[model samples]
Target: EILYIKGDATAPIGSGVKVITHICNDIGGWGKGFVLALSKKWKMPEEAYRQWYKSQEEFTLGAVQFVNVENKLYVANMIGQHGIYKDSKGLPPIRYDAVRQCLKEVALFTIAHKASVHMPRIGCGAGGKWELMEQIIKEELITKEIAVTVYDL
Candidate 1:
């Protein structure tokens, strides 16, 4: 089951290892939305993301970069979105397929590290449909028996 709570995802609540996941665009852009909170909490995630973009190594959609910000905390920078702006079809940048793929990887990492997943309503902020995003998260993470906590500010 997915847990819902009002709090900050940057400072995930609970014990054991914790993975803070968030959606990032594939265009090397990182200065808005949930990323600001992430940047404020730690500098490595942003720097690593920028370097990944600069390196152009596996920085495509569905790729996830995990940065260990603390001893027991990790930030998963998931490339789940396309360009930051809307496409010619006027559709939002949120890519459901990529998001699902990211979650699948996160599930594997969580299981391996014995960690719980924490995040805000991912993709919902950057012009995404929460209805679809929630379903994907449930299918990819919750169904795997991985603990997931959705944070709300």
Candidate 2:
């Protein structure tokens, strides 16, 4: 089941949670939109993400990097964008395939830890429609019995 709420994504939500969100590969200085709210609350995940990007042996899309923020709380940085939406030339802003792959990884992680998933309308800010992403989440995570939470703020 998917629960929708209105609040800051960085604020205390719950324990044993997997806070999922999207990020761009344009390390030339990414981290905008939803991530700005997150950074204000904690910078560890952001730092980990930057390091992960630099240490990647093989640059791969759909790679979801998990960062441990606390004993029970974790952050999932789902890489779904090739770069800034406009910089893609003719390519689409948000890659749905990458998003799905990332979510698929989240599904496995959630199952392993028995954690809940929460995030904003991922991939819809300037990429595409949240309606379709909701479907993708359901098919990939929720249907697999993962508790998903969507925030609107």
Model 2 alpha-carbon miss at residue 57, Å: 2.5
Give lDDT tens digits, candidate 2, residues 1-153. Answer: 788889766553766656565555534344577777767767977787777778874436788888887667788887777666565366666778888988898888888988888888787765668788889888998789888778886
Which ten-residue region of model 1 has the weakest summed lDDT? 124-133
Clash counts for the predictions, in order? 0, 0
lDDT of 1 by residue, 66-112 (tens): 99999999999999999988988888888999998999999999999
Least well predicted 10-residue stretch by lDDT in candidate 2: 21-30
lDDT of 2: 0.75
Candidate 2 has a TM-score of 0.87
Candidate 2 stretches with Cα past 4 Å from truth are: 12-15, 26-28, 87-89
Error of 1 at 152 (Å): 0.8
Cα RMSD (Å) between model 1 and the true structure? 0.8
Distance (Å) between predicted and true CA of 144, model 2?
A: 0.4
Q: What lDDT, from 0 to 1, does candidate 1 have?
A: 0.93
